[PDB]
Amino acid sequence: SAKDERAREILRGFKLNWMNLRDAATGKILWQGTEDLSVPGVEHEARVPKKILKCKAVSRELNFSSTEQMEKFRLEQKVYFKGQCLEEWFFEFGFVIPNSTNTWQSLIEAAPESQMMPASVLTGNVIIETKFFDDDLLVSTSRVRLFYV
Ligand SMILES: Cc1c(Cl)cccc1NC(=O)CCCn1nc(C)c2c(C)n(-c3ccccc3)nc2c1=O
C-alpha cells in the first residue's frame, strides 16, 4: 500500500521538538517538555503540576519539524481514565511546508465532569492517546501517561 508507506515517510521525517502548557488566562508557564512524544510504541510519561487542574483552560504550544509536505495536518486526541474516555479533542494545523519547523498554539478545555475529579484520583490513571493525521491518513499513534504532581 502506497498509503501505508506515505504515512511511514511522513513519520520518519517528523518530530516534536518541544511543547509548553500555560494557564490560558494569565499566560504563565505550567509545564514544558523536550522529548519527542510523536514517537509510537513507547508509553511516554508527563509529570505536570497539579495547579493545572485549577485552570478554566490551558494554552498549549507544539514546535515540530517535518521533512515531508503535509496537506492537512491534524490531531485527534482522546483522554482515558482507567480505559474510560473522558475527552475527545480535535485540532487542525493545516498545510505543512516540507522541511519546515512550526509552532502551533491550541486552546484546551476540559468538560465539567473532568474538572470534578481530583489530582489524587487522576494522577497515574490518565493516558492521552494522540493520533496524528495528514487529512484522512493515520501517520502515528502515541500515548502519554500523566501524573499530576
Ligand atoms: C486532562 C484534564 C482533566 Cl482529566 C481534567 C481537567 C483538566 C485537564 N486538562 C489537562 O490535563 C491539560 C493538559 C493537556 N495536555 N497535557 C499533556 C501532557 C499533553 C501532551 C503530552 N500532549 C501531547 C501528546 C502527544 C503529542 C502532542 C501533545 N498533549 C497534552 C495535553 O494536551
Numbering used by the authors: 2 to 150
What is written in the article reporting this PDB entry?
A major role in counteracting this equilibration to endomembranes is played by the guanine nucleotide dissociation inhibitor (GDI)-like solubilization factor PDEδ891011. It sequesters KRas from the cytosol by binding the farnesyl moiety, preventing that KRas binds to endomembranes and thereby enhancing its diffusion throughout the cell. Besides KRas, the PDEδ/Arl2 system is also crucial for maintaining membrane localization of other proteins of the Ras family, such as palmitoylated H- and N-Ras, as well as localization of the solely farnesylated Rheb on perinuclear membranes. Reducing PM localization of Ras through PDEδ inhibition raises alternative opportunities to impede oncogenic Ras signalling.
Herein, we describe the discovery of pyrazolopyridazinones as a novel PDEδ inhibitor chemotype that targets the prenyl-binding pocket of PDEδ with low nanomolar affinity. To identify alternative chemotypes for the inhibition of the PDEδ/Ras interaction with potency similar to Deltarasin (KD=38±16 nM), an in-house library of ∼150,000 compounds, assembled considering structural diversity of the underlying scaffolds, drug-likeness, coverage of different established drug target classes and inspiration by natural products, was subjected to high-throughput screening by means of the previously developed AlphaScreen Technology13. The screen revealed pyrazolopyridazinone 2a (KD=5±2 nM) as ligand of the prenyl-binding pocket of PDEδ. Structure-based development of the pyrazolopyridazinone hit class was enabled by a crystal structure of inhibitor 2a in complex with PDEδ at a resolution of 2.6 Å which revealed that, like inhibitors of the Deltarasin-type, heterocycle 2a employs H-bonds to Tyr 149 and Arg 61 for binding to PDEδ13. Initial screening and molecular modelling investigations (Schrödinger, Maestro suite) revealed that a C-3 linker between the two hydrogen-bonding groups is important and that shortening of the linker would abrogate H-bond formation between the amide carbonyl and Tyr 149. Therefore, a C-3 linker was kept for further inhibitor development. Since anilides display low metabolic stability, we searched for an alternative to the anilide embodied in hit compound 2a. Initial investigations and modelling revealed benzyl- and homobenzylamides as potential inhibitors, since they could adopt a conformation in which an H-bond with Tyr 149 is formed and the empty space in the PDEδ pocket is filled. Based on the fact that pyrazolopyridazinone 2a binds to PDEδ like the Deltarasin-type inhibitors, molecular modelling experiments indicated that 2k will form the same hydrogen bonds as Deltarasin and may additionally form a hydrogen bond with glutamine 78. Herein, we compared the newly developed PDEδ inhibitor Deltazinone 1 based on the pyrazolopyridazinone scaffold to the benzimidazole-based Deltarasin and the genetic knockdown of PDEδ.
